[PDB]
Design a protein around this ligand. Sequence first.
Ligand SMILES: Cc1ncc(COP(=O)(O)O)c(C=O)c1O
Ligand SMILES: Cc1ncc(COP(=O)(O)O)c(C=O)c1O
Ligand SMILES: [Cl-]
Ligand SMILES: [Cl-]
Lengths: 346, 349
Amino acid sequence: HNFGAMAKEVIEATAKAVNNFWEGLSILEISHRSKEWINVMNETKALMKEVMDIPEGYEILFFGGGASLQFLMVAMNLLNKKACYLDTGVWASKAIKEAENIGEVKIIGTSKDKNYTYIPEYQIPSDYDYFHITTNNTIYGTEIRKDIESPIPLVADMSSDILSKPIDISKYSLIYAGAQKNCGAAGVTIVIIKKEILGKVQRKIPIILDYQVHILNNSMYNTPPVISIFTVNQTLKYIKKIGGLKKIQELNEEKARLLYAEIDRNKIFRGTVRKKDRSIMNVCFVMEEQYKQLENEFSEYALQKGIIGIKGHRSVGGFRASIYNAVTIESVQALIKCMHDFEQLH
Amino acid sequence: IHNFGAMAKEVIEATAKAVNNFWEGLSILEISHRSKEWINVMNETKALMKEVMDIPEGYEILFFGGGASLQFLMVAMNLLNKKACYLDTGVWASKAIKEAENIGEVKIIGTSKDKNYTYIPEYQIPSDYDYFHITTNNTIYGTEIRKDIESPIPLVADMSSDILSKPIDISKYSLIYAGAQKNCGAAGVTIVIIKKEILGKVQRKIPIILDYQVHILNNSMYNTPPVISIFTVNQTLKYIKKIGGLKKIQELNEEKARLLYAEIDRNKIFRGTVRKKDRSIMNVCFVMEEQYKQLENEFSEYALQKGIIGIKGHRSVGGFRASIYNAVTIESVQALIKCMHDFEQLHTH
Ligand SMILES: Cc1ncc(COP(=O)(O)O)c(C=O)c1O
Ligand SMILES: Cc1ncc(COP(=O)(O)O)c(C=O)c1O
Ligand SMILES: [Cl-]
Ligand SMILES: [Cl-]
């Protein structure tokens, strides 16, 4: 019924563009070498600059594949001697592992000890090539709050929180996001990168994995993921129309605030995650121990009521409500009402 | 208007429909790739490709984001242990070779670089290399390979510009791949068809995201796949089946090329760049005769005024290139021919 929604303006625009993008030609059949497309590339780049307040010295790239390709690219392009990572979840852990296959990694802090229910403390050593974080840990519902000011280059996987709120881009040397959550449709990954960090690795880098080759060719070194890039272009237009990332944040903060209040009020349920590290985007909650056996009964009940895709990833069990930008206040209230009624029957 | 670029209309409409409402009011852009609705598409696309292409048992089908260039690297990382060999028949072939050389030892066993890749060289395949890589249709130069290739070592092939233009004997190949923006689908997806028993034989470490095994173990959803581009491949396969398979698709293409080459050869304004026996049926390259060399630009503008678009050659050849993908109609080819025939800069009657 409702739970991975994309804004409707963006769906309609995309469909329109499939029927007729330019002069009768479908967006699926135009050349990516044509000027019509190059213009979209550049406007999308200018839109992301505007909407996110990207300063000078940062390049914007679009890659096919996902955040996982970037786990590798980050390491191959910046890990010369050694790099450090914060282990806050499945995605953080998968980044760390890919990087370890390339060279030396120090894990400077982890919350693996308590099923990643919290964000650990850490001291950033000043002699590593870069420091990599995962800002929203999608599976465990933790996010990072502290304004991070790294003495070395700061790399961040924002797959699950890019375009949910404004950020200070200048604090980061490289930001990336698989784009299927907020931000766009499956098939594209965004990379925003402070060019001056490249060129400092003695290892050879394959051409297709070399950020410089991509920068020099404005992300069309080879065929880019046109339609997914288009959906990013529209999503940026909609965020601007509706008054920017300040506003997007307020609506999200609210949606999360209601849902966490319901979780905490309701005796059937409890949030898994420490209050202070609670993510605004992925809201994880399990059955109270007393009602543990009702877990499956409630899934079926939510499904009967038209709520879909709130099952947690396996490792945590319980539930996870992913409150992406395009999920409405109304879809959140119907969850709350489903949870409330579940409590009142028991 | 006549369109060198066209996608079949059934496929465009189906994709648009699926963007509005794929399943129970939800757009294909908003469903979960972890949902059963999507998994079913993944599998039906796989079963369709198996059916339509007659893929034997022991071959896996994978879908990758990115393009054929990512596969240049994956191929080498997954199969080049000691050394491999390549045939140099063009820009794409040369780019594959280069990426592979950055990984390990490559013997280039034949090249047509000597004559601006106007022909397909002879070669002897050495039996002690890990694999032999070819580019079956050389998109920029308009050559394709004809000989039925029977390799004594694993045969890898970049079919980006000819996949789904005709039936092939899949059993001859150990790995086939295709960036999919030319016949078979829309930009954002690359197909890989792979004989699984060739994997596992490399001493080098392979990054997880580049390891074909990890992908196969997860049915191409090790991570988020390119959903919409995969859907367009799913529809393209349905259309090919409806209209009677790859045998039919071939006849129509062979015809379209046959007409256009006859016109190129008949017309004194123009000449085909490529040796006759190696002529590609997909990418038709032709330049101005030397006598009419200065008319090159005048003719581009003339074609454009007449509604023909995107026939300009890649820089390295100049001249022209008519890409006669499956979805380009006989009628669009005739209007090119009629445009060419209106060479009254000569006064032929
Ligand atoms: C924070 C985070 N990082 C990385 C990924 C992996 O994304 P992809 O499927 O684009 O490789 C995801 C996917 O959900 C995610 O939420
Ligand atoms: C034969 C061949 N190989 C490789 C490529 C590169 O594919 P991609 O742009 O999908 O990297 C192309 C692009 O046309 C091609 O025609
Ligand atoms: Cl996670
Ligand atoms: Cl070529």
